[PDB]
Amino acid sequence: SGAIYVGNYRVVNRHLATHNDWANLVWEDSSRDLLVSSTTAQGCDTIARCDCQTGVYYCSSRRKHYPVSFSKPSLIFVEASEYYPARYQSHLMLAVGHSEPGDCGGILRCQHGVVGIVSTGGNGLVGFADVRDLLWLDE
Numbered sequence: 001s002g003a004i005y006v007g008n009y010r011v012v013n014r015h016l017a018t019h020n021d022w023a024n025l026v027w028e029d030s031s032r033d034l035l036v037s038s039t040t041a042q043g044c045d046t047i048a049r050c051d052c053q054t055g056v057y058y059c060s061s062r063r064k065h066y067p068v069s070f071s072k073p074s075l076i077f078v079e080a081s082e083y084y085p086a087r088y089q090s091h092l093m094l095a096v097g098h099s100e101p102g103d104c105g106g107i108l109r110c111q112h113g114v115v116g117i118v119s120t121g122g123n124g125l126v127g128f129a130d131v132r133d134l135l136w137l138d139e
């Protein structure tokens with residue numbers, strides 16, 4: 001689990017979104033596993049606007065943060081789940097690191113701010129949904 005709170009928005013994995021998230025829907029994209037809902041309180045997370053390929057993510061299944069090198073956002077094949085059939089998930093970045101399904105929502109940050117959230121993993125890899133291209137999160 002986990003979310004990004006920026007301005008009047010809450011960013012979460014689309015497969016983990018609540019009934020309240022869907023009742024206050026701003027934007028969702030099944031191909032990215034993202035959903036953004038509106039909030040009453042003012043969020044203070046800073047979104048990174050950069051092309052960093054190094055950062056640190058939070059891994060709940062180890063209660064630890066890990067430094068990682070990660071790939072550029074791209075279309076990557078993802079196994080079927082209770083939420084999606086087998087498909088290419090877009091805007092995804094892979095890194096070598098530990099992850100388990102419940103790790104989804106963990107934040108990946110670089111020196112500029114929030115880069116994305118854990119969305120996929122398996123076999124010593126972890127995949128992050130990018131949020132740096134969503135320029136409107138700041139306006």
Ligand SMILES: COc1cccc(Cl)c1CC(=O)N1C[C@H](C(N)=O)[C@H]2CCC[C@H]21
Nearest residue numbers: 015033078081099100101119120121122
């Ligand atoms: C961090 O996730 C894992 C880590 C290790 C192993 C495994 Cl199988 C996972 C889960 C995982 O890959 N996915 C990818 C899905 C997707 N984004 O399409 C998500 C929906 C429900 C399962 C989630």
Ligand SMILES: [Zn+2]
Nearest residue numbers: 050052110112
């Ligand atoms: Zn950066």
